Design a protein around this ligand. Sequence first.
Ligand SMILES: CC(C)CN(C[C@@H](O)[C@H](Cc1ccc(F)cc1)NC(=O)O[C@H]1CCO[C@H]2OCC[C@H]21)S(=O)(=O)c1ccc2nc(NC(C)C)sc2c1
Lengths: 99, 99
Amino acid sequence: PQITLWQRPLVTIKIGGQLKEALLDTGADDTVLEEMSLPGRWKPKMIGGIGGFIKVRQYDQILIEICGHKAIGTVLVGPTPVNIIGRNLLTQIGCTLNF
Amino acid sequence: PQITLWQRPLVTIKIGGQLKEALLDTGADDTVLEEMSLPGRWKPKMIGGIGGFIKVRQYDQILIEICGHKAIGTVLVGPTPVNIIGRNLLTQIGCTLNF
Ligand SMILES: CC(C)CN(C[C@@H](O)[C@H](Cc1ccc(F)cc1)NC(=O)O[C@H]1CCO[C@H]2OCC[C@H]21)S(=O)(=O)c1ccc2nc(NC(C)C)sc2c1
């Protein structure tokens, strides 16, 4: 699809058997999701944003479906306010910016 | 231009007579720039991101040139770690997401 930016660019994702809504975020290196129950082993990590840092649990090679496109990569889970699909997964679904 | 997301989507901007690099950020509602000297009056404000909040100075009706496209809008200035062009200006330069 082509998405204009008058509204937040939200998509439906399916991850760990659960449906969620998430922001397509070209400003995000990595993918960061609300506290959620994910299968497998993780690793503690800290990521920084505009206001400081949050602790996240990092899971590698997780399958996500992003608006009907499948990707596999790293997902971080923690106290983010919004679910964010970052460039590590946007590249896999072929997402580009155009103007 | 068409920008893929294998690297950060950075563009050059000219704002307040100064040249800066900035991130095209579909996850940012507003435009937030590192500490800089802007002319005119501002308004104190607080905005939230992944790690908490920062206090910013809000300047309205600011002219920016973003990779050769001119826009006028609100710019927030404060302790962000990256210059961020948010959706208030991305819409004006006709930026879309595509996959
Ligand atoms: C997190 C999202 C919802 C908002 N954020 C933009 C995202 O694109 C941020 C942009 C950024 C890049 C780099 C940075 F160092 C800091 C910040 N990316 C991000 O946090 O990425 C994290 C995690 C992913 O992995 C990494 O990616 C790089 C850093 C890691 S925001 O900046 O906080 C921001 C912007 C404008 C704005 N206007 C408002 N208006 C209100 C009045 C409603 S609120 C608001 C908040």
